[PDB]
């Protein structure tokens, strides 16, 4: 690995610099190098890893949607056939996206999840696993779409089970997990009623616990609660 010769602390420092520079491919490579040092990650370091790869895969998802739309249009009655290039380039971007997802899933499997024993770290990583299987599901069409969806579901479910046992209903990790699992239900699993029920129950249980929070924690929780509300408004 090209980061093998760099100090862990230097990789984290440069990840933060890359973030400031909006150089998210670099930021992800630095954080991959930091993970591969083999030590567990702090909460700030877990967040750097997530921010980096979410930005990288986010650009790929956006590009893939543009290209898939063009391809779908090209494949309709009355469309002048224009050769293999749209499909080829959509496939190129898709393969790069799947590669990023596989890299993240690899870091989680080797060995972030198995070393994560505290609820805050373990739920964070299992949510990430669900998220990157969900991004794989977004582009899956062959035999394995069903198995990819089930892998996402399983990871989210393990994360949910832990979060409900170990975290208050306002906890931001728990809230964002529920948000993303509800997105999985609506957008991937063809289960909009489950998505709505999860978002509603999550919102209501958090509302009832807000009185326990400081001003700063109240701000964190209500920001994510607003996203649940936004989706419920979209979905209903």
């Amino acid at each position: 690995g090209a980061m093998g010769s760099m100090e862990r602390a230097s990789l984290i420092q440069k990840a933060k610099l890359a973030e400031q520079a909006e150089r998210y491919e670099d930021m992800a490579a630095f954080m991959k190098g930091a993970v591969e040092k083999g030590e567990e990650l702090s909460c700030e370091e877990r967040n750097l890893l997530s921010v980096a790869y979410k930005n990288v895969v986010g650009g790929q998802r956006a590009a893939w949607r543009v290209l898939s739309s063009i391809e779908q249009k090209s494949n309709e009655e009355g469309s002048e056939e224009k050769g293999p290039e749209v499909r080829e380039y959509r496939e190129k971007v898709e393969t790069e996206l799947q590669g990023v997802c596989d890299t993240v899933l690899g870091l989680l499997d080797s060995h972030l999840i198995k070393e994560a024993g505290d609820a805050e770290s373990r739920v964070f990583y299992l949510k990430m696993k669900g998220d990157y299987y969900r991004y794989l599901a977004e582009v899956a069409t062959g035999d394995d779409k069903k198995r990819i969806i089930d892998s996402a579901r399983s990871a989210y479910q393990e994360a949910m089970d832990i979060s409900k046992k170990e975290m208050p209903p306002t906890n931001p990790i728990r809230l964002g997990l529920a948000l993303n699992f509800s997105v999985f239900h609506y957008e991937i699993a063809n289960s909009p009623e489950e998505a709505i029920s999860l978002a509603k129950t999550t919102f209501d249980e958090a509302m009832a616990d807000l009185h326990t929070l400081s001003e700063d924690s109240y701000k964190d929780s209500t920001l994510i609660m607003q996203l649940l509300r936004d989706n419920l408004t979209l979905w209903t």
């Binding site: 973030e19 997530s50 921010v51 997105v183 994510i224 989706n231 979209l234 979905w235």
Partner: peptide, 10 residues
């Protein structure tokens, strides 16, 4: 319009 997932928080 696609559903909103958890955003980045720097």
């Amino acid at each position: 319009q696609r559903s909103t997932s958890t955003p980045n928080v720097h």
